[PDB]
């Protein structure tokens, strides 16, 4: 378990794409170019995020996290684990 922390002051996507598999979990399905994660280097495509800002995304609607992440302001704390690079 790794606790990454990155501050976000601007209203824009972090810089990664994740989905909820049949098991229901947010994992970066693919890293986007230009994002803060791809530029700064906080996560990697495939990394498993057990928790997103204190909330574990499930098969349900993600709009809850998508909005919260877009409306969030400050240091974001995500629980991710390296799936062997």
């Amino acid at each position: 378990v790794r606790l990454i922390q990155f501050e976000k002051v601007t209203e824009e996507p972090m810089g990664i794409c994740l989905k909820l598999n049949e098991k229901q979990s947010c994992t970066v399905a693919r890293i986007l170019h230009g994002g803060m994660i791809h530029r700064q280097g906080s996560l990697h495509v495939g990394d498993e995020i057990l928790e997103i800002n204190g909330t574990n995304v499930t098969n349900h609607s993600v709009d809850q996290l998508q909005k919260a992440m877009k409306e969030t302001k400050g240091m974001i704390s995500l629980k991710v684990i390296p799936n062997q690079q």
């Binding site: 996507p13 972090m14 990664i16 794409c17 994740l18 989905k19 909820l20 947010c26 399905a29 693919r30 986007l32 993600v62 996290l65 998508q66 992440m69 877009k70």
Partner: peptide, 6 residues
């Protein structure tokens, strides 16, 4: 399958 960019 779906994918979210955030």
């Amino acid at each position: 399958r779906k994918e979210y960019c955030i």
